[PDB]
PDB file of C-alpha atoms in Angstrom:
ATOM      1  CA  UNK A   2       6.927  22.417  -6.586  1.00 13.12           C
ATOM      2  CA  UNK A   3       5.749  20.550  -3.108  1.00 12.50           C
ATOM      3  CA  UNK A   4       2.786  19.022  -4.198  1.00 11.87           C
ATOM      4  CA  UNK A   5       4.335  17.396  -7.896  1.00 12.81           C
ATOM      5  CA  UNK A   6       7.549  16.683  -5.749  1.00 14.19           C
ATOM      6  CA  UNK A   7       5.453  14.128  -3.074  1.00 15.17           C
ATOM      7  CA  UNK A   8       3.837  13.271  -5.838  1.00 14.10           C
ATOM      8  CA  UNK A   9       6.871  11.467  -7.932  1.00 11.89           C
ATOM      9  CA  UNK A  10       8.492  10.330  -4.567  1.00 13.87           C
ATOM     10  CA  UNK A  11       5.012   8.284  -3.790  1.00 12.18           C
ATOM     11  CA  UNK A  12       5.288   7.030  -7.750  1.00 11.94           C
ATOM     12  CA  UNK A  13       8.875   5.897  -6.455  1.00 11.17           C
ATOM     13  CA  UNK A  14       8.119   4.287  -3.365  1.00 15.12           C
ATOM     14  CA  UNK A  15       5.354   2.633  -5.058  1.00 16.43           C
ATOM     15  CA  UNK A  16       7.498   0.787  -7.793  1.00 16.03           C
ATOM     16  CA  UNK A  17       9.980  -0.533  -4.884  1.00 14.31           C
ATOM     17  CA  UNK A  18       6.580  -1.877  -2.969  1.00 13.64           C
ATOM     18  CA  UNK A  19       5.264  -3.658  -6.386  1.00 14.60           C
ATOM     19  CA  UNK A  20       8.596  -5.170  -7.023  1.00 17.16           C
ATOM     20  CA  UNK A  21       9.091  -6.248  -3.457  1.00 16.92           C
ATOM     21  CA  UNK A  22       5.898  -8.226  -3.390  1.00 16.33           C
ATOM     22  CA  UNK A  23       6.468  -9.916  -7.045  1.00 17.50           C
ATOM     23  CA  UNK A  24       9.452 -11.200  -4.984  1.00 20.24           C
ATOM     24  CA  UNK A  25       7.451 -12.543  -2.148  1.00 20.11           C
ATOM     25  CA  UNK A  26       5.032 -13.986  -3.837  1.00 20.44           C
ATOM     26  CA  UNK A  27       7.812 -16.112  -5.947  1.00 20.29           C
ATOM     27  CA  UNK A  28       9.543 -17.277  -2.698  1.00 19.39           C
ATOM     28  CA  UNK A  29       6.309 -18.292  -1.310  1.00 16.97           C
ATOM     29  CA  UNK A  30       5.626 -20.177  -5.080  1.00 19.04           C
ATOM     30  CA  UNK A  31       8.653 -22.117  -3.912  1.00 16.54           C
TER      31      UNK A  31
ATOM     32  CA  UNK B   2       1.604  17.023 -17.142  1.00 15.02           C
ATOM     33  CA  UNK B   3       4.021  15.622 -14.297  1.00 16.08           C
ATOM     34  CA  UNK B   4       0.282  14.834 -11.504  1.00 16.30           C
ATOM     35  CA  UNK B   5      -0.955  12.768 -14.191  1.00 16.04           C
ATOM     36  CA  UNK B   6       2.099  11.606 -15.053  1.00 11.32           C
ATOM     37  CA  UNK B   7       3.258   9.931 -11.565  1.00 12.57           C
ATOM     38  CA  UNK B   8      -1.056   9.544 -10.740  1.00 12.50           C
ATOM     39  CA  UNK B   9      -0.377   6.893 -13.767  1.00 13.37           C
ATOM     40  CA  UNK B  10       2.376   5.556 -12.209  1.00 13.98           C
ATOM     41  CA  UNK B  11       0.599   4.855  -8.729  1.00 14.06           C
ATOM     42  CA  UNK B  12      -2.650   3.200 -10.737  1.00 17.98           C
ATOM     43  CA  UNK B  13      -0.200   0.818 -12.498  1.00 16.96           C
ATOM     44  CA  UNK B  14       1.691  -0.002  -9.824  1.00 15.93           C
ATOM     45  CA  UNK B  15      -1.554  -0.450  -7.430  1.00 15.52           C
ATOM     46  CA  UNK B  16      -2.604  -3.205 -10.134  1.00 17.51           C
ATOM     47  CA  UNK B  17       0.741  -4.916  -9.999  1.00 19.20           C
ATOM     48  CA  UNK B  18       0.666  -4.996  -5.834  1.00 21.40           C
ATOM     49  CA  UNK B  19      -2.914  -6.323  -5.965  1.00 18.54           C
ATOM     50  CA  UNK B  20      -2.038  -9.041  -8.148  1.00 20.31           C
ATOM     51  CA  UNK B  21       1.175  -9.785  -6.249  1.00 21.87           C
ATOM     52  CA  UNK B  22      -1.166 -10.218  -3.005  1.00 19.94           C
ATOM     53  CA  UNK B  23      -4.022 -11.992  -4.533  1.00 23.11           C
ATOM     54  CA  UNK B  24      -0.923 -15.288  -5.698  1.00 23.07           C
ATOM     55  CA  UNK B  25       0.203 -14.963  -2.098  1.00 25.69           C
ATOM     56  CA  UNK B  26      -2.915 -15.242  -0.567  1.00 24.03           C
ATOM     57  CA  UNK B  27      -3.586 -18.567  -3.116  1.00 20.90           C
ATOM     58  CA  UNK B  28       0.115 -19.799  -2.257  1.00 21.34           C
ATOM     59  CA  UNK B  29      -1.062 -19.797   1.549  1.00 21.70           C
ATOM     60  CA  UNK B  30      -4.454 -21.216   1.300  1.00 22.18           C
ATOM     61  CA  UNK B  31      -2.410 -24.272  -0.659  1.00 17.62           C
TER      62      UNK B  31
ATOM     63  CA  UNK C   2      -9.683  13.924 -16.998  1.00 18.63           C
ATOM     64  CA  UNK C   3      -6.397  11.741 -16.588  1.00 19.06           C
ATOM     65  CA  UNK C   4      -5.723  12.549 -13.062  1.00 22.40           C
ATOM     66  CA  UNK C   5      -9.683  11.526 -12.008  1.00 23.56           C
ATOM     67  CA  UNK C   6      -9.538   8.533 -14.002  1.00 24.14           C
ATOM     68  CA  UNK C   7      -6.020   8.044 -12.723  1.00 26.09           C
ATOM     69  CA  UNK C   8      -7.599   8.338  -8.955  1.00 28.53           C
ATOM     70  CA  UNK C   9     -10.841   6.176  -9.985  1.00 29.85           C
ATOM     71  CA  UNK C  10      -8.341   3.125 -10.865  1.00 29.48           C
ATOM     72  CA  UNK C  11      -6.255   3.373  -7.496  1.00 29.37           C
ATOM     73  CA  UNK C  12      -9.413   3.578  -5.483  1.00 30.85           C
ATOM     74  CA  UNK C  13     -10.402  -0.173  -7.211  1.00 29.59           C
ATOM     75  CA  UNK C  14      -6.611  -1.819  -6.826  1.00 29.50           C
ATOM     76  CA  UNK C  15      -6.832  -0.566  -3.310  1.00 25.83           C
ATOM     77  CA  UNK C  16     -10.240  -2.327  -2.696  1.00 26.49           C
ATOM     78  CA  UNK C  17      -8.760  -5.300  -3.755  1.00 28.15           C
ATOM     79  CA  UNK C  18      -5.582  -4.940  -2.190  1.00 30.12           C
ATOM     80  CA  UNK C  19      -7.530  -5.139   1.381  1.00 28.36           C
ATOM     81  CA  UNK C  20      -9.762  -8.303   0.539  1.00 29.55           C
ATOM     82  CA  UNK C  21      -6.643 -10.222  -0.315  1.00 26.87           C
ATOM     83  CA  UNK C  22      -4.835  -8.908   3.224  1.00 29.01           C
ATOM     84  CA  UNK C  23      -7.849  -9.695   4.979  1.00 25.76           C
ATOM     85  CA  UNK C  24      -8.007 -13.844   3.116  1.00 26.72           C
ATOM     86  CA  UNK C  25      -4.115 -13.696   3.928  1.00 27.90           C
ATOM     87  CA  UNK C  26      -4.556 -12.994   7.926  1.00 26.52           C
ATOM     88  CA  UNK C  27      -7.551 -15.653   7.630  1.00 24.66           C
ATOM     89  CA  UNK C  28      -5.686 -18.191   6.235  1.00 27.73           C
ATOM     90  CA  UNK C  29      -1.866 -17.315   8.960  1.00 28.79           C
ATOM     91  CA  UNK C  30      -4.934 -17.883  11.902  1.00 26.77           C
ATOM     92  CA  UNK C  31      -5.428 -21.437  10.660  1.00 26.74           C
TER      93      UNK C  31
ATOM     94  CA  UNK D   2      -1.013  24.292   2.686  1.00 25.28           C
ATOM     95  CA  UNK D   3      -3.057  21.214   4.242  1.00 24.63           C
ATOM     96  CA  UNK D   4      -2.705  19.012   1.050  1.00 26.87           C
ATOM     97  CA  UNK D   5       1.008  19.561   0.241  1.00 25.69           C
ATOM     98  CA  UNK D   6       1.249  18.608   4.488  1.00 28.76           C
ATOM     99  CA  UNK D   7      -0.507  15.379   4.199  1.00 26.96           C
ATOM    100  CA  UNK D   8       1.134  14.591   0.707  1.00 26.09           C
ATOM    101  CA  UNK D   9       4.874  15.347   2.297  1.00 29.15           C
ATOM    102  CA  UNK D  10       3.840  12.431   5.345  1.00 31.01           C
ATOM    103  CA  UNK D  11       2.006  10.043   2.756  1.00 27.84           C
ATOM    104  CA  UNK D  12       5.640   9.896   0.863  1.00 28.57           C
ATOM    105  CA  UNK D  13       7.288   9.802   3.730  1.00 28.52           C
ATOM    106  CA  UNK D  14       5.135   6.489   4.865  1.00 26.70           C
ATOM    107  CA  UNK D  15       5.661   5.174   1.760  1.00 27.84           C
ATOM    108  CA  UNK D  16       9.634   5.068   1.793  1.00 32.21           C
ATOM    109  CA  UNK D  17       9.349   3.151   4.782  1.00 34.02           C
ATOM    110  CA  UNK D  18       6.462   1.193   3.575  1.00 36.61           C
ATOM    111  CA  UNK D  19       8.857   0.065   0.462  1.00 36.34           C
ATOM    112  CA  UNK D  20      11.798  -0.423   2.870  1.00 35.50           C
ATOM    113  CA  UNK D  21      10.015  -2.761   5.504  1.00 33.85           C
ATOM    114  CA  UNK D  22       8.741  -4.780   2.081  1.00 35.67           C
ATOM    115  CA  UNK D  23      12.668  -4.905   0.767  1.00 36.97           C
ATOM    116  CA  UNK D  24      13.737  -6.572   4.585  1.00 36.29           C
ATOM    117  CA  UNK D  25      10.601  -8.901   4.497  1.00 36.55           C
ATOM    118  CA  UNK D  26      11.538 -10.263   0.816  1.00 37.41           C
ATOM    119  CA  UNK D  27      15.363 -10.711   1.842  1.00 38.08           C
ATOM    120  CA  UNK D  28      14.210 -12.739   4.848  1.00 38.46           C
ATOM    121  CA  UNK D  29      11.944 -15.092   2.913  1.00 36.37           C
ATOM    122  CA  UNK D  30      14.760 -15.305   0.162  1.00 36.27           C
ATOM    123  CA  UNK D  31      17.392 -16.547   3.014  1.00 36.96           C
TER     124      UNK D  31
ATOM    125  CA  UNK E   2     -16.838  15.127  -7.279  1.00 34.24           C
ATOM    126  CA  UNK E   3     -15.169  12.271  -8.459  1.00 36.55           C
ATOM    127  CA  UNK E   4     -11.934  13.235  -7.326  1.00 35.82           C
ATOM    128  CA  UNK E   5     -13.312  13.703  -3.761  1.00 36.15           C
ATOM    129  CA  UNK E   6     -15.339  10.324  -3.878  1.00 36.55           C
ATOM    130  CA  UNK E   7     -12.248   8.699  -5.127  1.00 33.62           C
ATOM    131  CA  UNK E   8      -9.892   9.947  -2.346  1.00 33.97           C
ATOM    132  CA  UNK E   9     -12.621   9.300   0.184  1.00 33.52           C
ATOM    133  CA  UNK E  10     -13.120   5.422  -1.052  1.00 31.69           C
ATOM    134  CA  UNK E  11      -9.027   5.305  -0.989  1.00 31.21           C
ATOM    135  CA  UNK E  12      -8.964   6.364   2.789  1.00 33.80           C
ATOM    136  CA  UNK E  13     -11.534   3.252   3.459  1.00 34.29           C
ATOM    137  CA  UNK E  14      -9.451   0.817   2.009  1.00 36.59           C
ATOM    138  CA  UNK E  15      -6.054   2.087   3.726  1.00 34.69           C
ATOM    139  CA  UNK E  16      -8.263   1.768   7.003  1.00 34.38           C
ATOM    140  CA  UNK E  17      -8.965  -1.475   6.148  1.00 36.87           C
ATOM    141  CA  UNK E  18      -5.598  -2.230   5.047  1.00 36.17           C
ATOM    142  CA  UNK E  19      -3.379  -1.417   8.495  1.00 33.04           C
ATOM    143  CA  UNK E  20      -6.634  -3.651   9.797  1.00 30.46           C
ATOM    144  CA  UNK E  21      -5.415  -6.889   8.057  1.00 30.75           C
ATOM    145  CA  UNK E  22      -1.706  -5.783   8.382  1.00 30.20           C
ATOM    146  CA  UNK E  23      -2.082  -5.744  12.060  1.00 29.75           C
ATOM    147  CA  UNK E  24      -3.748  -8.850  13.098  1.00 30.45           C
ATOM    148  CA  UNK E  25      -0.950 -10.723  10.518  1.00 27.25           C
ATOM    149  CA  UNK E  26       1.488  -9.031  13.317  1.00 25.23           C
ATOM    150  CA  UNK E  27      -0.488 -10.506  15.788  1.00 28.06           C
ATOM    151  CA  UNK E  28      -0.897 -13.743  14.195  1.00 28.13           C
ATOM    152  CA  UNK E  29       3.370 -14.037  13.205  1.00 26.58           C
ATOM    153  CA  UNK E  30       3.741 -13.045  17.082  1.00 23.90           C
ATOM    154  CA  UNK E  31       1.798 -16.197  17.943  1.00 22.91           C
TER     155      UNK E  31
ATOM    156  CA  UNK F   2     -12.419  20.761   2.445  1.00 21.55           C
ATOM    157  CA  UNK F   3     -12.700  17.342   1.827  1.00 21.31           C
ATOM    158  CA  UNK F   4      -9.976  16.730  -0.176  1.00 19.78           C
ATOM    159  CA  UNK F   5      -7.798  17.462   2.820  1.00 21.05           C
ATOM    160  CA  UNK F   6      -9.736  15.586   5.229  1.00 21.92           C
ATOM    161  CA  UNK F   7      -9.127  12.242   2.838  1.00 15.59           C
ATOM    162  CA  UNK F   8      -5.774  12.986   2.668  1.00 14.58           C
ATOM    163  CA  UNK F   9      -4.928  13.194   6.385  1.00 12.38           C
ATOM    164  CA  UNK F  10      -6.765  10.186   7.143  1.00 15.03           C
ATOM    165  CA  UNK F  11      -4.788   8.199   4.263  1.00 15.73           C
ATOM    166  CA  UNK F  12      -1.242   9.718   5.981  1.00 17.61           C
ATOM    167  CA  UNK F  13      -2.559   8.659   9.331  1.00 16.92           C
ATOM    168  CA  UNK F  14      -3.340   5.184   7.631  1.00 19.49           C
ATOM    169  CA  UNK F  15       0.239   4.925   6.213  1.00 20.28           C
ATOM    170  CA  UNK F  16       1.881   5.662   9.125  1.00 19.55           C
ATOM    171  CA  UNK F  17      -0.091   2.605  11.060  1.00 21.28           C
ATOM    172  CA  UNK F  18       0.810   0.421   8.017  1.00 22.72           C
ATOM    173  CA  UNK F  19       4.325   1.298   8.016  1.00 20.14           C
ATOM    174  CA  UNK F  20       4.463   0.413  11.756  1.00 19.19           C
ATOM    175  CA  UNK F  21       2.481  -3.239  11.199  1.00 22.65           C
ATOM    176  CA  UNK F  22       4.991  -4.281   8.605  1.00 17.49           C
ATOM    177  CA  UNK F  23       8.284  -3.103  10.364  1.00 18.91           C
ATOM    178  CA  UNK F  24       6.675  -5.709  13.246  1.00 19.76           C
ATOM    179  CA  UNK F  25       6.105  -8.535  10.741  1.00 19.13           C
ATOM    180  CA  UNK F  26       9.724  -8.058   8.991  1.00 19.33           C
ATOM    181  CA  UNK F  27      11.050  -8.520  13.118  1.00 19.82           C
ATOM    182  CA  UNK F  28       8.632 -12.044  13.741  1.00 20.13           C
ATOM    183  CA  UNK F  29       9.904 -13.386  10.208  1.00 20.86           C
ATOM    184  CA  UNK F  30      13.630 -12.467  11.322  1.00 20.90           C
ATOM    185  CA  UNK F  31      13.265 -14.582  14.783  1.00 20.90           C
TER     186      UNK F  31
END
C-alpha cells in the first residue's frame, strides 16, 4: 500500500497549498 | 481506482494554485 | 487512461505555475 | 522500490510545503 | 510514453519553480 | 527507468522549494 498511501498524502498536502494561496491572494486584493 | 482517484485530486488542485498565483502576480504588478 | 490524462493536466498547471513565480520575483525586484 | 522512495520524500516535501504556505498566509492576515 | 513525457515535463517546471522561489527569498532579504 | 529518474529529480525539487518558502515565511515575519 506505499505507493497509493504517498499518493493520497500528496492529494492532502495539495488541498492545504491551494487553500493557502486563495488566502494570500485575498489579503494581497486588500 | 484510489491512483486515479488522488492523480484527480492533484490536477484540480494544480489548477486552483495556478490561478491563485496568476491574481497575485496581477495584485503586485498594480 | 485517467491516470495519463490525470498526469498530462498537472504537467500544464505546473507550467503555468512557474511563469507566474517567475512575473512575481520580477515585479518584488522593482 | 525506487518509485515508492521518491514518492515517500515528494509527500514528505509537500507537508512542509503546505505548512510554510499556512505561516506565510497568517502573517499577511496579521 | 506519455506518462514518462509527462513526469519528465513536471520535473522542468519544479526546477524552474524553486528558481523563482529562491530569488523572491533573495529579493524579501533585500 | 525513467520514471524513477523524474521522480527523484521532482523530490530533490521539493525539498529546495520547501526550504525557499520556510525563508520567505521568516523575511515576512521581521
Amino acid at each position: 500500500g506505499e505507493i497509493a498511501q504517498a499518493l493520497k498524502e500528496i492529494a492532502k498536502a495539495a488541498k492545504e497549498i491551494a487553500w493557502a494561496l486563495k488566502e494570500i491572494a485575498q489579503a494581497l486584493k486588500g
